[PDB]
Every structure is written in structure tokens, then in C-alpha cells.
Amino acid sequence: KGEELFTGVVPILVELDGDVNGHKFSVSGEGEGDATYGKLTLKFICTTGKLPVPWPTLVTTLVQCFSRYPDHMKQHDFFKSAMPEGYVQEATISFKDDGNYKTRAEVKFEGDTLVNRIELKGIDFKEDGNILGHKLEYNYNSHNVYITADKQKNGIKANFKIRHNIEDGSVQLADHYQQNTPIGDGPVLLPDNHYLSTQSALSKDPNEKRDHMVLLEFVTAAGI
Ligand SMILES: [Mg+2]
């Protein structure tokens, strides 16, 4: 039944409150998703001033229900199956040789809009490390998100490594460990092992003076 809510274009709202090494900030995002094509278009704004971390470090925190699941994999789409009541998504993002983010989000429908509400806490970042030193390029590599079922929580786990390009040609690794659990009492789809193939393009709105990020993303399920 939840997949029925995604056959057309769906408006998206994202609201994040963050604290990284005591630097407090908020981000508001608006856009739309079209799961038929695994396509997301979003604009995020830092509503509190300057973002204290690089925008690319927030991309995985800032709605995998818009993935394109091929018809032959439709029985493996947990994310849509949990809608409209939604799911809780928790992650730990470990930056190699640096600090970590812990996030908690609720993703659910509010009327006909898909909403992602997030709290992010970052600790033990190095002041002149790649994150607080803002040494990351404004770009995003393509990645696979590996999904496995968590039968005991009636949900799923996801594991992946993000490779963030550093301005000097090196790479900043970020290990991601995520868990999702449904909010409602109805049944959800528990998938076989598979992955999400993601591609993301970051840009700016040339008329915008606030600190912001324009994102175009494609997400396709595969491996089955
Ligand atoms: Mg390079």
C-alpha cells in the first residue's frame, strides 16, 4: 500500500537541527521527488547563517523512499512500505581520523508532503581537520548503499563508505551505519540483500546570497 503514494511527483520538506562541536545550526530544504525515475531535486538553505561544516558532509543526512525499485525488486522496497506512517532513521557517520555525526530522523507524510525531520549531533572534530577546516570540494561521488534486513526490529540496516574529495587530491572517508525502524504497526517489506546506486550533483542558485545547496540526485535499487 505505501508504494501507491509514490507514483507521481511528491513535494518534499527537510528540516534539520544540528550541533557540531558546539556550533549550532539549522537547515531547511524544499523540493520534490519522483520515484518512478529515482529522481530528487532539492534546495537547502542554512537558516541560521553560515554553515559550520561543509555542505557535502550533510548530503546523506538530508529520503530513500524516492529510490527507483525495478518492478522485479518491488517486494524489497522497505522504505515505501512504511508509508504513510513512516520510519525512524538513525545513523552514525564516522569520519576517518576525525569526528563523528550521530543523527536521528523521522520520515513520514504530512498530508501529501514527504517530510524528513532530523537532529544531528557532531563531536570530537579536529579544528583544522577537513570538516571544520572546510577542506572538502563542493562535489559528491557516486556510491552504493548496501541494505540488509533487520528482522528483529522489523526494519533494515544500511552500510556504506562515502568518499569525500579533499581540495588537495586526497580523500576523506566517512563510514555510514544506518538503521531504520517503522513508526506504524502495519506490515513492511523486509528485503533481501541489495544496494542503492546513487549519483548526486551539487550546485548553487546564482541569485541566492544565503548559504545553500542545490542538489540533483538519482537513486536506483539493484543487485537482485
Ligand atoms: Mg581531485
From Swiss-Prot:
Changing residue 150 to V: In EBFP2.0; shifts the excitation and emission spectra to shorter wavelengths and increases quantum yields compared to BFP. The keyword Magnesium does not apply. InterPro entries: GFP, GFP-related, Green_fluorescent_prot. Changing residue 144 to K: Increases fluorescence at warmer temperatures such as 37 degrees Celsius. In Esmerald; leads to brighter fluorescence. In VisGreen; leads to brighter fluorescence. Keywords: Chromophore, Luminescence, Photoprotein. Changing residue 170 to G: In GFPA; leads to enhanced fluorescence at 37 degrees Celsius. In Venus; leads to yellow fluorescence, improved maturation and reduced environmental sensitivity. Changing residue 37 to N: In EBFP1.2; shifts the excitation and emission spectra to shorter wavelengths and increases quantum yields compared to BFP. Changing residue 75 to R: In Azurite; shifts the excitation and emission spectra to shorter wavelengths and increases quantum yields compared to BFP. Changing residue 145 to I: In Azurite; shifts the excitation and emission spectra to shorter wavelengths and increases quantum yields compared to BFP. Changing residue 123 to V: In EBFP2.0; shifts the excitation and emission spectra to shorter wavelengths and increases quantum yields compared to BFP. Changing residue 198 to I: Suppresses the 475 nm excitation peak, leaving only the shorter wavelength peak at 399 nm. In H9; increases fluorescence at 395 nm excitation. Contains a chromophore consisting of modified amino acid residues. Maturation of the chromophore requires nothing other than molecular oxygen. It holds the Pfam family GFP. Green fluorescent protein has been engineered to produce a vast number of variously colored mutants, fusion proteins, and biosensors. Further generation of mutants led to more stable proteins (at 37 degrees Celsius for example) with brighter fluorescence and longer fluorescence lifetimes. Changing residue 157 to Q: In R10-3; matures to the red-emitting state with excitation and emission maxima at 555 and 585 nm, respectively. Changing residue 166 to V: In EBFP1.2; shifts the excitation and emission spectra to shorter wavelengths and increases quantum yields compared to BFP. Photocytes. Changing residue 188 to A: In mut1.5; shifts fluorescence lifetime from 3.03 to 2.72 ns. One of its GO terms (biological process) is bioluminescence. Energy-transfer acceptor. Its role is to transduce the blue chemiluminescence of the protein aequorin into green fluorescent light by energy transfer. Fluoresces in vivo upon receiving energy from the Ca(2+)-activated photoprotein aequorin. This is Green fluorescent protein. It comes from Aequorea victoria (Water jellyfish).
